[PDB]
């Protein structure tokens, strides 16, 4: 009995630089929430059909979840660039699974701003697909090495979102769930009812 | 007093040690 429901219904969501991964295996898959795709602002499946997942069997299913702005949801797709795809959460070109997002302004925005959700603002290079970086190493913005000391041209690598409920929809927080359906050379443990 | 992420928020998220 797979805990797909708890991934979507989790009270706390991760900041996107520290995106949470939940491996799903050795269980009976309840795909009911994927049939209710009309209730999500984003619901894009790549090489998957929710009505056919019962007939299919998988070795593992990873559920990555985080909060980003609504105007950043478009970056959670194959072949995208931008601050999120580049420095926070990268999907591969060959991605197989679904990207599901919904507005969470009522929960994740605060008057004055919710500075508790962060994204990585600086990084020496782009992430590889599915790479996760939670280091807080001071970023060398000038030509002079920082030696890890925060200050002049040496910046804290992460930035607060400061979500406010009166910001426009594109700047509002959205909770995102990315499901990767993995069928590797092993026995399938995630099957339908 | 802190740029990018305020100091209290850095403590709240476990980013100081
Ligand atoms: C903006 C940097 C700063 O004021 N301090 C460095 N530091 C941390 O960054 C903790 C994560 C320790 N300091 C404080 O805890 C007080 C805000 C000082």
Author numbering:
A (entry chain A): 336 to 528
B (entry chain B): 1 to 17
Quote the authors verbatim.
However, these antibodies work by blocking binding between the human ACE2 cellular receptor and the receptor binding domain (RBD) of Spike (S), which is one of the most rapidly changing virus:host interfaces. Rapid screening of diverse bacteriophage libraries against SARS-CoV-2 Spike yielded unique Bicycle binders across the entire protein. Amongst the different epitope groups, only E2 Bicycles were capable of directly competing for hACE2 binding (E2 IC50 of 520 nM).
To determine where on RBD E2 Bicycles bind, and the mechanism by which they compete with hACE2, the crystal structures of two distinct E2 peptides in complex with RBD were determined; E2 and E2b. Superposition with a RBD-hACE2 structure (6M0J39) suggests that E2 may be a direct hACE2 competitor but this is less clear for E2b. Full name of scaffolds: TATA is 1,1’,1”-(1,3,5-triazinane-1,3,5-triyl)triprop-2-en-1-one, also known as triacryloylhexahydro-s-triazine; TATB is 1,3,5-tris(bromoacetyl) hexahydro-1,3,5-triazine; TCMT is 2,4,6-tris(chloromomethyl)-s-triazine.
